[PDB]
Amino acid sequence: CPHIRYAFQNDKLLLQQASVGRLTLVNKTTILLRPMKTTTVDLGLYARPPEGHGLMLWGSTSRPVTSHVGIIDPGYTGELRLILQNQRRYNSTLRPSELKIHLAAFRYATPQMGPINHPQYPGDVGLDVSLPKDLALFPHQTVSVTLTVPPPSIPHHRPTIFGRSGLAMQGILVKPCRWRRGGVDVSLTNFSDQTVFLNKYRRFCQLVYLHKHHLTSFYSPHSDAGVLGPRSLFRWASCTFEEVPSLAM
Numbered sequence: 356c357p358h359i360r361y362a363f364q365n366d367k368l369l370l371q372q373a374s375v376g377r378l379t380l381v382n383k384t385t386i387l388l389r390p391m392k393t394t395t396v397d398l399g400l401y402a403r404p405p406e407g408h409g410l411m412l413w414g415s416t417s418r419p420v421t422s423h424v425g426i427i428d429p430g431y432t433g434e435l436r437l438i439l440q441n442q443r444r445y446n447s448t449l450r451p452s453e454l455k456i457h458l459a460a461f462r463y464a465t466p467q468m469g470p471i472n473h474p475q476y477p478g479d480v481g482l483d484v485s486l487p488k489d490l491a492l493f494p495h496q497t498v499s500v501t502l503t504v505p506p507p508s509i510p511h512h513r514p515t516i517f518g519r520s521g522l523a524m525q526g527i528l529v530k531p532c533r534w535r536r537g538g539v540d541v542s543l544t545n546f547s548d549q550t551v552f553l554n555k556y557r558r559f560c561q562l563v564y565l566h567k568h569h570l571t572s573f574y575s576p577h578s579d580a581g582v583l584g585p586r587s588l589f590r591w592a593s594c595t596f597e598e599v600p601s602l603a604m
């Protein structure tokens with residue numbers, strides 16, 4: 356893996372390190388999360404992956420806060436944002452150092468074929484997946500749905516489900532998960548105060564084919580359970596970050 360070019364400028368976040376293919380930021384100031392509302396952190400971070408790769412953006416904290424896991428498309432030249440939700444019904448604070456923000460690359464593949472939709476732009480990582488039925492997501496509840504018809508099989512890659520940013524901004528998070536052979540149960544949580552009605556055929560998540568190297572059972576400084584959970588640890592590509600300040604917009 357050749358360089359991930361990046362720029363970073365944000366005096367409210369510290370660059371902890373950019374090592375072994377993962378860049379980590381930490382919060383220098385308190386971030387307040389109101390209950391029932393989305394909190395977005397504008398990272399002041401811009402990045403471009405090398406050929407054949409996307410980027411994965413995620414947050415880690417021991418506080419009662421859930422972060423959207425973001426799939427960053429290779430053509431994306433805008434600012435990266437971290438989308439957070441409050442698990443509690445009262446204000447939750449992330450004191451300095453309590454939030455870690457990680458960025459790292461992965462190889463992905465794309466099939467040519469709803470319910471699974473082609474990438475919307477050249478090189479987009481995820482294929483949107485359509486809802487098979489109408490769902491009513493009441494506030495602070497989780498609703499699950501099963502996808503049973505197999506996605507296309509891609510040698511040496513593994514189908515996985517991630518959320519999309521638009522729904523996350525509305526307070527609806529998808530728990531990322533592997534789509535194994537017998538089907539996948541996709542769980543959607545509504546962290547807002549509004550009942551959200553999602554109808555049949557609505558795009559509600561995306562299918563990503565991660566190269567099999569990026570999924571491991573082994574814990575190390577090269578992997579993290581914060582992406583897809585503790586069974587399927589995310590092991591990112593061994594790329595090098597290269598600072599290119601002109602990427603900042």
Ligand SMILES: O=c1ccn([C@H]2C[C@H](O)[C@@H](COP(=O)(O)O)O2)c(=O)[nH]1
Pocket residue numbers: 412423424425426427428431434435436437438518519520521
């Ligand atoms: O947590 C996220 C997810 C996505 N993006 C950027 C990069 C993506 O290419 C683009 C669109 O994301 P989606 O709507 O596909 O999730 O937004 C972020 O900044 N943060």
